[PDB]
Amino acid sequence: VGRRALIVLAHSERTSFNYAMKEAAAAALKKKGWEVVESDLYAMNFNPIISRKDITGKLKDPANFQYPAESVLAYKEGHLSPDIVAEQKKLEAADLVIFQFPLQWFGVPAILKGWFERVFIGEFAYTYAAMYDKGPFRSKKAVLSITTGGSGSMYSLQGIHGDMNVILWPIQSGILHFCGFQVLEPQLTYSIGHTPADARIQILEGWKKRLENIWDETPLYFAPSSLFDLNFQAGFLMKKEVQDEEKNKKFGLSVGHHLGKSIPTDNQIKARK
Amino acid sequence: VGRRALIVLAHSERTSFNYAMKEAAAAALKKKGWEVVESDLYAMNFNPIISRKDITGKLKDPANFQYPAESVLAYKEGHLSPDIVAEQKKLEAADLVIFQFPLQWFGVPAILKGWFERVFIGEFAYTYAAMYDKGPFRSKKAVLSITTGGSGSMYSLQGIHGDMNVILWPIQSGILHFCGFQVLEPQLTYSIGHTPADARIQILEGWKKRLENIWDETPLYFAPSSLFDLNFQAGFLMKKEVQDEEKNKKFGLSVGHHLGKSIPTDNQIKARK
Ligand SMILES: Cc1cc2nc3c(=O)[nH]c(=O)nc-3n(C[C@H](O)[C@H](O)[C@H](O)COP(=O)(O)OP(=O)(O)OC[C@H]3O[C@@H](n4cnc5c(N)ncnc54)[C@H](O)[C@@H]3O)c2cc1C
Ligand SMILES: Cc1cc2nc3c(=O)[nH]c(=O)nc-3n(C[C@H](O)[C@H](O)[C@H](O)COP(=O)(O)OP(=O)(O)OC[C@H]3O[C@@H](n4cnc5c(N)ncnc54)[C@H](O)[C@@H]3O)c2cc1C
Ligand SMILES: O=C1Oc2ccccc2C(=O)C1CC1C(=O)Oc2ccccc2C1=O
Ligand SMILES: O=C1Oc2ccccc2C(=O)C1CC1C(=O)Oc2ccccc2C1=O
Numbered sequence: 297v298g299r300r301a302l303i304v305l306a307h308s309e310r311t312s313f314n315y316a317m318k319e320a321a322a323a324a325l326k327k328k329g330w331e332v333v334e335s336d337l338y339a340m341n342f343n344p345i346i347s348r349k350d351i352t353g354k355l356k357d358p359a360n361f362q363y364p365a366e367s368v369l370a371y372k373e374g375h376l377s378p379d380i381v382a383e384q385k386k387l388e389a390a391d392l393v394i395f396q397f398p399l400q401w402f403g404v405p406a407i408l409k410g411w412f413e414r415v416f417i418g419e420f421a422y423t424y425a426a427m428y429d430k431g432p433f434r435s436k437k438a439v440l441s442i443t444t445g446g447s448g449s450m451y452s453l454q455g456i457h458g459d460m461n462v463i464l465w466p467i468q469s470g471i472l473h474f475c476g477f478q479v480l481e482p483q484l485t486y487s488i489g490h491t492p493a494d495a496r497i498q499i500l501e502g503w504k505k506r507l508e509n510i511w512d513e514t515p516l517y518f519a520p521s522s523l524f525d526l527n528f529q530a531g532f533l534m535k536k537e538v539q540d541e542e543k544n545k546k547f548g549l550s551v552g553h554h555l556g557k558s559i560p561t562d563n564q565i566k567a568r569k
Numbered sequence: 570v571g572r573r574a575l576i577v578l579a580h581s582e583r584t585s586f587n588y589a590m591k592e593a594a595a596a597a598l599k600k601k602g603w604e605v606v607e608s609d610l611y612a613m614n615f616n617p618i619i620s621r622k623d624i625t626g627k628l629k630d631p632a633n634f635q636y637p638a639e640s641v642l643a644y645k646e647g648h649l650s651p652d653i654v655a656e657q658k659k660l661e662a663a664d665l666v667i668f669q670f671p672l673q674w675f676g677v678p679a680i681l682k683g684w685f686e687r688v689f690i691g692e693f694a695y696t697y698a699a700m701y702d703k704g705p706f707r708s709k710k711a712v713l714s715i716t717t718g719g720s721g722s723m724y725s726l727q728g729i730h731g732d733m734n735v736i737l738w739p740i741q742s743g744i745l746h747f748c749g750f751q752v753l754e755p756q757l758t759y760s761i762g763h764t765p766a767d768a769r770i771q772i773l774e775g776w777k778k779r780l781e782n783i784w785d786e787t788p789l790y791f792a793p794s795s796l797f798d799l800n801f802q803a804g805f806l807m808k809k810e811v812q813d814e815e816k817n818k819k820f821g822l823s824v825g826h827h828l829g830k831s832i833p834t835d836n837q838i839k840a841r842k
Pocket of ligand 2: 580
């Protein structure tokens with residue numbers, strides 16, 4: 297079960313429906329006994345740019361500065377900047393991580409992206425030796441709560457923007473699952489800019505209604521890492537037994553692991569029935 | 570033909586391969602008669618966070634602030650933040666926009682994502698009435714030049730990161746193609762952190778070659794806007810006649826337009842033969 301929950305919001309206006317959603321989640325989660333902690337990126341005036349200032353003290357190779365190594369080193373010896381360390385503290389303690397933000401240019405707002413690049417340091421959020429399903433945040437569950445200007449049909453298979461599942465992949469898979477996170481069904485609240493009041497009220501209440509049991513939900517599907525040869529010799533390719541056995545399957549495994557076949561419907565929006 | 574190019578660099582180190590790719594692209598482009606203009610985001614101390622300070626004027630509704638509407642008005646009247654106006658001015662002048670950068674968390678660097686969000690302002694870079702191929706930059710050609718830590722076999726259909734094509738989709742369709750840009754094939758340089766010295770030199774060399782005739786190449790394939798009814802009524806869905814006609818094609822039109830079928834090989838990486 298979960299006790300602690302971290303809500304990371306990415307939005308400047310407090311009058312925004314996004315801000316409303318964050319409160320709605322804290323309210324609802326508290327009532328159920330969760331200890332909520334917040335990360336109001338804009339309110340915290342968070343720094344989204346990685347640089348040799350995230351490492352406090354002498355770098356190992358000042359001439360040739362390599363962010364990864366330096367910050368992995370800094371994490372180990374305790375020289376990460378206070379603000380990055382702070383966020384890594386909330387996370388370390390969180391069981392459930394909610395990401396609330398408006399969809400911008402088909403991704404997380406720049407400030408949220410920067411948050412990941414700085415907070416998710418190696419050794420802390422990931423190691424090559426244990427990527428994906430075997431990562432550090434594997435004991436935690438995360439969730440995207442996105443708001444979009446476009447209608448949900450623009451994001452449908454025949455939608456002019458294309459399958460919302462492809463858009464989601466880079467984030468739920470590339471960023472979240474790559475660290476061990478169990479990714480729950482995203483809370484997609486389409487066309488918010490064109491939703492009436494009564495409709496908007498209901499939305500909030502639904503989000504809260506969902507959050508009262510968010511933890512017992514079955515997570516989205518991702519190809520287990522046991523299906524690959526996680527060694528460089530193999531180039532991290534999908535095991536030969538698996539490759540062959542999968543050939544009789546009409547559907548691929550996930551959006552990313554489509555194998556040039558048919559992507560399973562809503563692989564990134566709905567958890568396996 | 571093109572006489573003006575804009576090279577956008579998103580890396581903090583001048584000792585970096587990315588910075589070297591940036592010099593190569595200019596030295597090559599200029600030598601062939603181009604007028605190169607750069608935007609070294611980091612070197613510029615570029616602010617990636619969209620806020621109201623981006624609008625130096627009287628907001629239409631300061632109480633309930635909304636970046637889209639407010640940012641557009643600022644562009645129309647002319648009180649946008651000087652730095653942004655400076656950028657946009659580089660984009661009106663460019664025929665070719667090159668985006669040099671290290672793939673990070675399966676996407677563009679936060680600072681770069683900030684750039685799109687602040688500079689690509691409605692009316693300037695796009696309008697709902699003119700989505701995609703009808704966009705304002707339809708006479709411009711863009712190209713992503715990405716380097717990664719991971720081996721190309723990791724981004725293979727069988728790789729543990731999944732089809733690289735899915736990862737590139739959000740950027741090339743969502744951000745660049747939405748604005749009208751014709752997207753050229755992405756110059757992908759996998760595991761640059763493992764490439765031998767001689768190959769690194771060849772990669773630089775090769776990059777300079779392609780650049781020689783980068784403007785006559787055939788662009789990546791996107792579903793033309795003419796395949797969709799583009800009115801909030803019909804839901805911006807793919808026309809009826811069109812749907813029925815595609816029922817007979819083995820492959821989907823693109824990554825985000827796979828229509829549940831197989832995705833055409835390297836739809837977002839290789840142009841059509
Ligand atoms: C840079 C940028 C990039 C974008 N890129 C994309 C993109 O790629 N794809 C896309 O689809 N969209 C995109 N958008 C649109 C964006 O996703 C939406 O404008 C945003 O998600 C709307 O969320 P909001 O809360 O900020 O809305 P806010 O406008 O009275 O408001 C929505 C409504 O909620 C109401 N409201 C506020 N609080 C409450 C409350 N407590 N209870 C009830 N009602 C309330 C408001 O009054 C308002 O009418 C982009 C916008 C920007 C600025
Ligand atoms: C937050 C974050 C997220 C990341 N996410 C991902 C991801 O999702 N997927 C992924 O695959 N990778 C990822 N990476 C790894 C990243 O993509 C690579 O480290 C980066 O692209 C390497 O490019 P560089 O220009 O910095 O390299 P730089 O290390 O001697 O160097 C590359 C090589 O080029 C050499 N070199 C430098 N200048 C020159 C020159 N002028 N001529 C010839 N050789 C030269 C260098 O000495 C070096 O050996 C991530 C890194 C970070 C920090
Ligand atoms: O809110 C909208 O209003 C519209 C009205 C008429 C016709 C089409 C649209 C849209 O596609 C969107 C969504 C939308 C938006 O509000 O902002 C964006 C910024 C960058 C890229 C994509 C988008 C969008 O798809
Ligand atoms: O350097 C990286 O940093 C990352 C940061 C966030 C998300 C993804 C990645 C990566 O895929 C790689 C590539 C990557 C690499 O450069 O070296 C390796 C060595 C052994 C096993 C696996 C790998 C990798 O996946």
